[PDB]
């Protein structure tokens, strides 16, 4: 594949990383 597809995925994964970490910190705290 084109390597730059990883940067496009990075944009989507980074938003869900932020969602997942904040919801996680709220559940465990």
């Amino acid at each position, epitope marked *: 594949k084109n390597e730059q597809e990883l940067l496009e995925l990075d944009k989507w994964a980074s938003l869900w*990383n932020w969602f997942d970490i904040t919801n996680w910190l709220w559940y465990i705290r």
Partner: antibody
Amino acid sequence: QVQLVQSGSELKKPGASVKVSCKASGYTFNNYAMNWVRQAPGQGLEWMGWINTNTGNPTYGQGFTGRFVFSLDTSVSTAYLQISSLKTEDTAVYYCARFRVAPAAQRGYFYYYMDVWGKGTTVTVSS
Amino acid sequence: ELTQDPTVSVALGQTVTITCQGDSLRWYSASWYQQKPGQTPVLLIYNKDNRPSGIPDRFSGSSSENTASLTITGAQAEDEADYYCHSRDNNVFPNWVFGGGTKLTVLG
């Protein structure tokens, strides 16, 4: 011979616009991202943003919105940086580099690196 | 990475560690670049500790907590230069930053 060749030095008046070029050689241009870096006099390196060389979509770094436009001419393996409404403080060396990305060990994460660099273009803005 | 010591000093043959500190370094690795006066930057270390083929074995990369480090083993005169770390910043959307840079002085 994998290399990036940048356009020559330039002088502009405040309020004008400038277009700097970055031509890739020795590899397939649209297979890798390109990024731009600014270095003002006596200062450090600053991330300006990157451009998808497969689609032409630009992603501007924080602080480089509005007056900065990334574009490409894939038919000649060249990426462009246009700065509009130039200010004296835009005086700097502008680098293009190949922006590489690879998957990290942790899912959803990546690492990045700039493996090939152009020699820089000096842009001076003065009255 | 975000913050980086402005100046650092070494002695020929000794080892020195240049360190960048930033919250994003807890999740993303850093790459490290050398820039000598008037020269274009050169990639030294990527993905925390991988070395391009042209780079001498003196240069090593590491990471710990919110910090990433470049270490030089056999410090020589040719290593007197500026060193910059690069990684993601703290923005939710993908954005990148250079550290402020470290001037290395090799004494003796």
